[PDB]
């Protein structure tokens, strides 16, 4: 991909009066998201289709059941996480010219509420882990089928530690707000 | 009475109740009325001829 | 593909004199639809012909089946209309060097045209949803076979959100209209 | 491929004292004919030999019947069009030096004499269709066999669109040689 | 990847007062280890799912077997190891824009345990060598089975010197504590 439209975007959105909170926030979301997201990430879901086999001669039975067990790959998830949580922060370019205090307090609490809402839809869709065995009974797969997955330590351990980031987020989001009145 | 063209498997090493087809599952009901009618009627017969001789 | 160039152009192109609305449109097209397409979008329609497989011996009935299904993907649809978008901004680096209002509303109508007409080709040729099933009765195919489809359930959702802000951007266009004469 | 070269060689370029039919034929040329080849061009044609298929055992027929067929691809042809159509403004950058309008005179002449010459081998090689049958009777084919094609309608667009865009410069370039004498 | 993000935030990192120690360290840590991660790395583990094979005709052995040999490839567990080495570092902007020595200690501190904890994490995860023969007794696989290894000779190479960097640096680390009491 382009990471570099968003560096600039965001080097040109940050010249903003903040506070101790908000710097913490940016540097976290800056390190620990993003520069693990755009390096390790793209290389260990290539072959999520191609090494996912079912026990059956039926075609059209890997394609339904794949589907049916991973509608979403979490990175696309994830990318779409970072780029709404920063929106906010890039619509002071917008809102800057125009003049050429309330705006932090509409930011603070859209931010809130996006990042509880992506935490919680993550615990809905995929969950704590993800195991080497499926069942699958969806048409035209006969009555059930095994069907197995490819690398399944690999990305439980991502899972993991995207949980305990967005926590540690939401703890700060919560913190700054409070500070507020 | 009749032979059919599926049978589902479930034993071992058969994952959970697998399908299977059959080959010519109609010349072999064929075959098994036709005996069975014939055995039937040299039953009969063999009854008949221990009545008529039989106490 | 090289987003870098669009990038520049742009950046030189919005030197212009706006209001509060074409920002707002601005905004709006650059986060939720280049970002998007940039970096989420070449890698889910990489494996669709590859993928695609009909029930049958017959060579040259899978070829024909995906030309009929698909005979456009959406990622290239979505990437003219962002270019047919923005053309009436870029311009303006023309029209400035050879003056060196009018051209507003020109631009403007030209936009709400352009916005419109890309909707209503879209929903008559893709519609609201890609099932996993797809019935063929072309040529050299036999009368009448099943194909099946991949990742039916990751581009619904790509349709369903690029529908939602082309429906944005026409409210916009419309309201920057009414605010005319 | 790398297509930073060429744009930082025109910038370099379009220091030159021109009129309002230059600049369109320039934004022109920038726009529907670069932006469309560099983003959306090379992935079209990237299956062309891998997903054409011949209905024979004989070792040899694809490779011979895909040659026979598409002799060249249209990407290229349309990559050389652009640099030979580019190349008259690029010789402005040696012209200056030595220097410290009848080139002006020389550069049109010879626009005119490529862009037309461009256009009518486009005529004669492809056509205006690509049909998703081929019939192949070339050694060693036994006497003749159909061989089916791959996304035969995704490209009969581009071939529309690149015939309409050559027209249209076509005219531009006469309706500024009509205007010196 | 994108190494250049990580280029420009070091570059306006290291602005930071420091001594002979830090700066020896700091080129170590650049060349020794970035350098060869960034161009030698991510070409050998490319092939390591598709020529990893079993001797066995059961669907799902290969898989299994595989994510119980190597559940994280050496690259990532690296390029992990190398972000958080230099973070400590990273955070030195928000301290600055802040006030604008006790850091340093914390700094110290905590790269010591960052190293330390590293090295042994991967004495216990990989060893010393990666030999060509793996067996395996997890599901679906019948109660043992071989299964062998790619290029099993590239990769102790890696292992070995990343050992002995990761040596140095945390001799280096302990030297610069003992430096101040
Ligand atoms: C993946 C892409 C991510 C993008 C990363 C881009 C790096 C950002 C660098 C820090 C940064 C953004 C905010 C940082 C928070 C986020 C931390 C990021 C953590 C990531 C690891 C600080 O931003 C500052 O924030 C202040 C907030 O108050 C603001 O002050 C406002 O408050 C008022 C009250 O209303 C308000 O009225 C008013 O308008 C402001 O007065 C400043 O205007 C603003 O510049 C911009 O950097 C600035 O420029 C240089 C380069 O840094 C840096 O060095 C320069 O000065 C040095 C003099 O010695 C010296 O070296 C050189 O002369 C020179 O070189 C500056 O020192 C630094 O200041
Ligand atoms: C992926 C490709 C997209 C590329 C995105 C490029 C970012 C664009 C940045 C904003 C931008 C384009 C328009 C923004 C709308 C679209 C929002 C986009 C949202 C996307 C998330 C504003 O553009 C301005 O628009 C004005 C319209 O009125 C115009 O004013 C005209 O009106 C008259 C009436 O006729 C007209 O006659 C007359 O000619 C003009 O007077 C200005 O000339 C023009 O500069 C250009 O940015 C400008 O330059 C800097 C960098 O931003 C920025 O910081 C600078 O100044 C700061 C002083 O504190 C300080 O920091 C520094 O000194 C410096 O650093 C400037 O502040 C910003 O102004
Ligand atoms: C994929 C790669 C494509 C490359 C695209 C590069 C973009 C080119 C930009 C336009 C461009 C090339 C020509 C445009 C035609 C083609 C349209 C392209 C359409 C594509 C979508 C104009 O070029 C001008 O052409 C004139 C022709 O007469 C020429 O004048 C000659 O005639 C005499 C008679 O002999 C002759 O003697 C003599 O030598 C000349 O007097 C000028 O010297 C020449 O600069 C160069 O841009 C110039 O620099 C800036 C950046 O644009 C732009 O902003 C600057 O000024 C602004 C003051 O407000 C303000 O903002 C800022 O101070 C600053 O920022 C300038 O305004 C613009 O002028
Ligand atoms: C993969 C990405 C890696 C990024 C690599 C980036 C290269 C870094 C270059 C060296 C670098 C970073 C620190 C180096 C240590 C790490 C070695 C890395 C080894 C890697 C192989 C030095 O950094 C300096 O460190 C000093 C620490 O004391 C600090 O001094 C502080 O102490 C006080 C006490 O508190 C403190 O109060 C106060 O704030 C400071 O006074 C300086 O402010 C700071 O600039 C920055 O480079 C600086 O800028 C130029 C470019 O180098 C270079 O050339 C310039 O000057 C030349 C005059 O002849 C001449 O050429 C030119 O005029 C010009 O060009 C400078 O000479 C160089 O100085």
């Not at chain 1, 800056?30 to 026990?55: P, S």
């Not at chain 1, 125009?98 to 992506?118: M, W």
């Not at chain 1, 919680?120 to 009974?137: A, H, R, T």
């Not at chain 2, 009325?33 to 017969?45: E, H, R, T």
Request: net charge negative.
């Amino acid at each position: 991909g382009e990471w570099t439209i968003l560096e600039r975007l965001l080097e040109a959105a940050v010249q903003q009066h903040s506070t101790m909170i908000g710097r913490i926030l940016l540097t976290v979301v800056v390190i620990f998201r993003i520069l693990i997201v755009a390096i390790v990430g793209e290389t260990v879901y290539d072959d999520e289709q191609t090494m996912f086999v079912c026990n059956t001669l039926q075609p059209g039975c890997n394609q339904a059941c794949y589907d049916r067990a991973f509608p979403i790959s979490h990175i696309r998830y994830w990318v779409f996480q970072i780029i709404m949580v920063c929106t906010p922060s890039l619509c002071f370019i917008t809102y800057s010219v125009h003049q050429s205090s309330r705006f932090y307090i509409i930011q603070v609490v859209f931010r809130n509420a996006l990042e509880i809402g992506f935490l919680v839809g993550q615990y809905f869709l995929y969950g704590f882990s993800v195991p080497g065995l499926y069942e699958c009974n969806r048409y035209p797969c006969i009555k059930e089928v095994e069907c197995y997955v490819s690398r399944p330590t690999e990305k439980t351990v991502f899972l993991v530690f995207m949980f305990a980031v967005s926590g540690i987020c939401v703890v700060l989001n919560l913190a700054e707000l409070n500070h507020l009145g | 009475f009749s032979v059919p063209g599926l049978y589902e498997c479930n034993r071992y090493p058969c994952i959970k109740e697998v399908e299977c087809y059959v080959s010519r599952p109609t010349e072999k009901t064929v075959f098994l009325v036709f005996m069975f009618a014939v055995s039937g009627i040299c039953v009969v017969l063999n009854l008949a001829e221990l009545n008529h001789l039989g106490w």
